[PDB]
Amino acid sequence: TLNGGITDMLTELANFEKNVSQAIHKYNAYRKAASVIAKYPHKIKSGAEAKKLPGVGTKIAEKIDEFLATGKLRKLEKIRQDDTSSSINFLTRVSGIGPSAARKFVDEGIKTLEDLRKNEDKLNHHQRIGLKYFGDFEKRIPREEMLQMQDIVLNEVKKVDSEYIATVCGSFRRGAESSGDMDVLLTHPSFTSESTKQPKLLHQVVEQLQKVHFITDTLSKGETKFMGVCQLPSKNDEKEYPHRRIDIRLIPKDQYYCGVLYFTGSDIFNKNMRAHALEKGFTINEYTIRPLGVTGVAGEPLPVDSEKDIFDYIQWKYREPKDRSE
DNA sequence: CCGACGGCGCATCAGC
DNA sequence: GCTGATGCGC
DNA sequence: GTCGG
Ligand SMILES: Nc1ccn([C@H]2C[C@H](O)[C@@H](COP(=O)(O)OP(=O)(O)OP(=O)(O)O)O2)c(=O)n1
Ligand SMILES: [Ca+2]
Ligand SMILES: [Ca+2]
Ligand SMILES: [Cl-]
Ligand SMILES: [Cl-]
Ligand SMILES: [Cl-]
Ligand SMILES: [Cl-]
Ligand code: NA
Ligand code: NA
Numbered sequence: 001t002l003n004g005g006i007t008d009m010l011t012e013l014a015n016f017e018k019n020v021s022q023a024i025h026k027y028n029a030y031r032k033a034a035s036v037i038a039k040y041p042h043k044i045k046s047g048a049e050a051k052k053l054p055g056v057g058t059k060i061a062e063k064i065d066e067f068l069a070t071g072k073l074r075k076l077e078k079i080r081q082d083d084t085s086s087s088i089n090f091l092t093r094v095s096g097i098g099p100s101a102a103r104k105f106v107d108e109g110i111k112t113l114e115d116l117r118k119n120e121d122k123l124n125h126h127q128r129i130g131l132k133y134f135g136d137f138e139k140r141i142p143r144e145e146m147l148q149m150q151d152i153v154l155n156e157v158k159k160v161d162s163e164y165i166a167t168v169c170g171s172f173r174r175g176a177e178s179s180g181d182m183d184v185l186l187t188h189p190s191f192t193s194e195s196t197k198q199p200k201l202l203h204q205v206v207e208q209l210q211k212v213h214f215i216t217d218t219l220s221k222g223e224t225k226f227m228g229v230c231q232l233p234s235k236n237d238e239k240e241y242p243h244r245r246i247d248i249r250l251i252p253k254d255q256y257y258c259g260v261l262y263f264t265g266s267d268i269f270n271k272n273m274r275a276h277a278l279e280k281g282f283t284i285n286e287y288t289i290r291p292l293g294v295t296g297v298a299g300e301p302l303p304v305d306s307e308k309d310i311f312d313y314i315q316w317k318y319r320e321p322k323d324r325s326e
Numbered sequence: 327c328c329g330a331c332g333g334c335g336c337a338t339c340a341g342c
Numbered sequence: 343g344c345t346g347a348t349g350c351g352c
Numbered sequence: 353g354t355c356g357g
Binding site: 099 | 351
């Protein structure tokens with residue numbers, strides 16, 4: 001909360017550039033500025049002070065001078081007062097509706113939750129489920145429930161094959177007291193970088209969790225990534241638990257460390273870590289870290305035995321999951 | 327109309 | 343069907 | 353919008 005005023009300001013501007021201006025690179029620049037400011041251990045006193053930080057330029061500095069002097073920003077005042085910009089921004093909050101669909105919908109006079117409910121014929125399956133659970137999906141998950149959820153998934157996976165190993169990642173793994181959704185990393189010795197010895201490895205797991213009624217709906221589903229919905233069982237004369245988003249990712253067993261690094265996040269941390277790589281002369285994805293060369297073609301994968309190894313290649317020193325909340 | 331800016335899975339469309 | 347783009351998602 | 357070639 002040290003500089004919460006300023007970081008809240010820049011996050012709002014970011015959300016506007018992404019969802020309204022359709023300017024993904026201005027969105028990324030605002031989020032980077034908010035992030036570097038959030039890890040700064042002093043209270044900012046002027047724009048000039050701010051401009052010293054990497055990712056803060058002439059324009060963001062003038063905006064900080066205005067906020068510090070007046071407690072608000074005229075630019076954001078007007079944006080808030082623009083009903084068209086507000087509707088576009090709101091619609092993107094539904095799972096499956098992005099900037100293009102939101103602007104299309106608003107150009108067509110659809111701009112409220114009610115408007116979507118009576119125009120479902122304009123929505124695809126993904127968007128309909130996002131609508132169904134919109135309230136449920138706005139809510140966060142107390143760590144106590146994340147624990148119950150973890151116990152169910154691990155027990156059912158084990159009943160399918162004792163050789164599976166399931167790991168809960170994302171903000172949960174970063175130690176957060178509440179999470180936005182559940183992310184499950186899955187491995188099995190049958191699936192490696194070399195060969196796919198077992199068919200429907202992901203399918204057998206999804207199908208058992210559906211059989212005991214933990215997973216309730218599917219958003220998308222392929223050979224390695226499941227995106228859907230789940231719910232804990234409740235007691236009689238007891239309010240139902242909210243439905244929750246769940247993501248499952250089957251990663252080759254020999255690529256577990258790059259996988260868990262990617263799946264732990266946070267997102268801006270990943271963006272910032274992969275950017276440092278590029279100027280260190282490497283490129284990191286969820287499968288490998290590689291060195292690059294003169295034609296823009298990446299080299300062979302480098303050896304990896306832990307998460308620390310990846311930090312090493314780029315001369316960052318290790319950071320516990322709880323310190324990756326950039 | 328300096329141009330890059332992190333990287334990719336799944337679903338769908340344009341022009342073959 | 344393909345390749346290459348787009349759109350939304352992690 | 354920021355930075356750097
Ligand atoms: N643009 C993104 C979004 C996500 N991720 C990775 C890092 C995230 O931690 C992980 C899961 O994404 P989530 O949206 O579930 O984000 P979190 O778990 O970190 O936060 P929370 O679910 O609490 O909102 O995927 C990423 O690399 N790039
Ligand atoms: Ca999550
Ligand atoms: Ca997630
Ligand atoms: Cl942009
Ligand atoms: Cl303001
Ligand atoms: Cl690895
Ligand atoms: Cl790869
Ligand atoms: Na700067
Ligand atoms: Na959305």
